[PDB]
């Protein structure tokens, strides 16, 4: 019950991020119009990504498993509060704590992996953690839909409380001027503007105030900075899933089959990434993905049987992330000092999250800009090429992560 408990806590952050793609079913029950009822659901990550460091630090100080006990307990009220009562001002209050739930779990449960294992076992521990995250988030959209169509929107949150219990049953030093920075920084990526120019200021401001209110010169720094750059290519699938479905006029399933082919491939290479192990496999992963992008880029100048070039790309892309993820979850969790893991793990978890947001936003904006100026096929390449640059910068980012 080492991973069996940890995974149960990670999969509490699956059933949270499943309702996000069932936002219309909630529209009926909770009543209030979309935009307000949608942003309500968004709050779960918004608050998670900003608090992860603080909730990691208050786990670092006042007990690791203490905060994993809080998070798993806070996930019960997080779900029970929503599933039971169907009204709007209610939903907001439940999604915000569903977010802090994750902020407590991710860093703390990541620190337990260091204690429980302490080398050699850490390889099998962090690999099981990756399966719990990648595989969990990987289906969350495909899950939430399957549940809402047949069981219901509330029947995805009855699975949240029981798995959160079966997890526990199978086992302010400027924080406020960091969350104000990260609140701003998170909503800056969501660019709906003229007015966002001043919203970039509050980020730069609250950054330098927290900067003058933390002396890492380890390979852990190299792993975190590379992990950020590497997750910048996250847009690749979003821009690909679009191109395939709009440009090549495929159905929803074939798009999902290309995607779930990537999913199983990345899930059966975090295991092989474990055996691969530190710096060597992380260079192979960050490399082979860039070819995986190029393989999906060249399907913008294709033939009739160029579906292969796209397919082999999804595998090439999938397997590369897998070969990088287990070694690089370990290179960080290793050098992270036992005295300060909860704070260190939260930063690695934050850096991973911001990387994805920063990536997708660029990938989308470029695609939306390029496809307007030129066409779908031409525009896709311009967007896919921008993913290559970050993938190469992710391969160059390993240069500052010594053996």
């Amino acid at each position: 019950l080492i991973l069996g408990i940890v995974l149960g806590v990670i999969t509490f952050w699956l059933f949270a991020q499943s309702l996000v793609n069932v936002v219309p079913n909630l529209q009926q029950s909770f009543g209030t119009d979309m935009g307000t009822i949608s942003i309500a659901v968004s709050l779960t990550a918004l608050f998670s990504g900003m608090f992860v460091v603080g909730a990691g630090g208050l786990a670092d100080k006042i007990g690791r498993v203490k905060m994993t006990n809080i998070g798993l307990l806070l996930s019960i009220i997080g779900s029970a509060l929503i599933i039971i009562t169907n009204l709007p001002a209610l939903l907001i209050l439940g999604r915000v704590i569903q977010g802090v739930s994750a902020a407590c779990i991710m860093p703390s449960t990541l620190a337990i992996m260091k204690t429980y294992y302490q080398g050699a076992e850490r390889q099998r521990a962090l690999s099981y953690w990756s399966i719990g995250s990648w595989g969990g988030s990987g289906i969350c959209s495909l899950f939430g839909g399957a549940v809402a169509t047949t069981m219901g929107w509330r029947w995805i949150f009855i699975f949240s409380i029981i798995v959160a219990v079966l997890s526990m049953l199978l086992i302010v030093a400027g924080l406020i001027v960091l969350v104000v920075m990260l609140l701003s920084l998170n909503v800056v990526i969501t660019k709906g503007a003229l007015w966002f120019f001043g919203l970039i200021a509050i980020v730069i401001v609250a950054f330098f105030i927290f900067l003058n209110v933390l002396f890492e010169n380890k390979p852990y720094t190299g792993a975190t900075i590379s992990n950020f750059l590497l997750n910048g290519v996250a847009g690749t699938l979003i821009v690909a899933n679009t191109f395939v479905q709009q440009g090549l006029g495929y159905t929803a399933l074939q798009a999902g089959y290309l995607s779930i082919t990537y999913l199983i491939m990345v899930l059966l290479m975090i295991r092989v990434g474990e055996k691969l192990l530190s710096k060597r496999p992380m260079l192979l992963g960050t490399f082979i993905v860039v070819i995986g992008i190029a393989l999906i880029s060249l399907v913008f100048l294709p033939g009739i049987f160029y579906v292969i070039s796209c397919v082999v790309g999804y595998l090439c892309f999938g397997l590369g992330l897998g070969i990088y993820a287990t070694p690089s979850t370990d290179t960080a969790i290793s050098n992270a000092p036992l005295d300060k893991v909860g704070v260190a793990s939260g930063i690695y978890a934050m850096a991973s999250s911001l990387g994805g947001a920063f990536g997708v936003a660029i990938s989308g904006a470029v695609y939306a800009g390029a496809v307007a100026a030129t066409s779908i096929h031409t525009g896709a390449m311009i967007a896919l090429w921008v993913n290559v640059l970050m993938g190469i910068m992710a391969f160059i980012a390993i240069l500052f992560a010594i053996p």
Partner: nanobody
Amino acid sequence: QVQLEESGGGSVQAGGSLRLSCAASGYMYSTYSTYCMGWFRQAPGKEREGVAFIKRGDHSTYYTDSVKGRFTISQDSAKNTVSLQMNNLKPEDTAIYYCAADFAHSFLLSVHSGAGQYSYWGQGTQVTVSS
């Protein structure tokens, strides 16, 4: 930063034909998701009413009782656009036809109709029929 650019419609005699085409610029699909797209009409007197809708993922369509059989919504997949082909029109169909699309959702979830569920709206294309 999505723009529903819509075209077609116009004036015609009763029991005639009028195409209505609409396309969504830079509306990307999530990792396992799609969106629904269709038209709502609103005559100068009557209140807003849904016409025809299609889910872009699996070409799953839905119509209002009024137009059913006469109207046919579909998407010209290679050219990336939804178009409502309206036939045997009657003076009831005379109204401002607004193209709309809802926030992305898992393609598993069923096609949408209710104006509250749809979020993106267009300027509106006029269609009028007479003797």
